[PDB]
Amino acid sequence: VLMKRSITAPLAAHISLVNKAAVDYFFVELHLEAHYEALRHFLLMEDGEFAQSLSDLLFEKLPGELLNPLVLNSVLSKALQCSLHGDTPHASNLSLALKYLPEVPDVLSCLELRYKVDWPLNIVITEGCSKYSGVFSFLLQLKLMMWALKDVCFHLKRTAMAGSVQFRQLQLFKHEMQHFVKVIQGYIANQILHVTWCEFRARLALEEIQRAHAEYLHAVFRGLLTEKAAPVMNVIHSIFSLVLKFRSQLHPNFALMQQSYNTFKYYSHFLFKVVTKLVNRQPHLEDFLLRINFNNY
Amino acid sequence: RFIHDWVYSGVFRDAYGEFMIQVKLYWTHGYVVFLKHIAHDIYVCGKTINLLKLC
């Protein structure tokens, strides 16, 4: 018999003590549990009064402006003051940099927001886990709707005497278009911030930390950013684009807007079919149809 | 004795390469009989000690 017990027995007794002392060293001394619940406050825009203050500032402008480090590198230092949560050593290291020079109605404004760490934490949070910047540019793009759409809701308020069929029939479009954005956002605020955070919070409590984190963010699957369900994402742009055109025409050109809304009701009616056909082939998408459809077809 | 380094002291000792393991990212100590159930574990049981030495 060849039972190798004289080696592993004085060995395994010491392996568990090192690892348990290695992981414990991270939490009770370097606050690994804090960094996660802090980057979410800033990157994933979980903390209100911050995204509602950052995006609200940038959207006030819209080329050569809004691109030099004198405004965008300073709008952040003005944003954190209006956060009412932060201004800690964690709150720094928010390099609000860019990765493209835009030339000149669309729904795109490319801009990154990268966290920064130091040595004993950089070895765990990978310099590729760059994927937050992938999920961030989507979430910011969503805010562009709930502000521009809020504008036309506020732009129309000052128009009020002027009560006729042309007026009331117009405002029903906004309530019909806003509700679609306020439900797709309610979905995002359920998958990428609450249930995917239930896991990886009751999951943790050294190699595992790398994989557990690589499984938490891999937030990009329930976020409709994966190339597998990409056609579901392509249709979203057609919706977001038409709302932007609806903002341009702030009744000299009513009919020009009436055609726009009819294009909106068609595309939305097409989404409900493309998601249904993609159920036979993903339990994450299952909750979407229950969100987009409720007492309708 | 070589194996008795990464477990107690963490000072990797090499002479001619008899060890199966030789020597930002900081994790480039290339690695690749005895039970493999403990083979890969020794490779990580040392790098942790060599990482706490710099902290």
Place of tokens 């903002």: A247
- The answer to whether the Cβ–Cβ distance between A22 and B26 falls below 8 Å is no
Residue A170, token pair as written in the block: 């117009």
A206, A93, A94: which is closest to B55 by C-alpha?
Answer: A206
Neighboring chain A residues of B8 at a CB cutoff of 8 Å: 14
Which chain B residue's Cα is nearest to A117? B24
Which chain A residue's Cα is nearest to B4? A11
Place of tokens 């943790």: A204
Calculate Rg over the CA atoms of chain A.
Answer: 24
Residue A175, token pair as written in the block: 């309530």
CB B39 within 8 A of CB A10: no
Among candidates B34, B48, B55 on the partner chain, residue whose Cβ is nearest the Cβ of A18: B48
Please report, as a single letter, which amino acid is at residue A76: L
Place of tokens 């149809």: A289
The helix (H) or strand (E) run that includes residue A283 is: helix A283-292
Helix-helix angle A254-277:A283-292, to 10 degrees: 140
Name the maximum alpha-carbon separation found in chain B.
36
Which chain B residue's Cα is nearest to A128? B25
The helix (H) or strand (E) run that includes residue A285 is: helix A283-292
The conformation of residue A95, written as its DSSP 8-state character, comes to B
What gap in Å lies between CA A42 and CA A88, rounded to an integer? Answer: 12
A20, A13, B6: which is closest to A5 by C-alpha?
Answer: A13
- Resolution of this entry in Å? 7.0
What gap in Å lies between CA A48 and CA A55, rounded to an integer? Answer: 11
Torsion angle (degrees, nearest 10) of CA A132, A69, A106, A45: 30
Please report, as a single letter, which amino acid is at residue A183: V
Place of tokens 């060599």: B50
Residue A108, chain B, CB below 8 Å: the answer is no
Experimentally, how was this structure solved?
cryo-EM
SS3 content of chain B, % helix, strand, coil (to 5): 40, 0, 60
Among candidates A4, A120, A206 on the partner chain, residue whose Cβ is nearest the Cβ of B55: A120
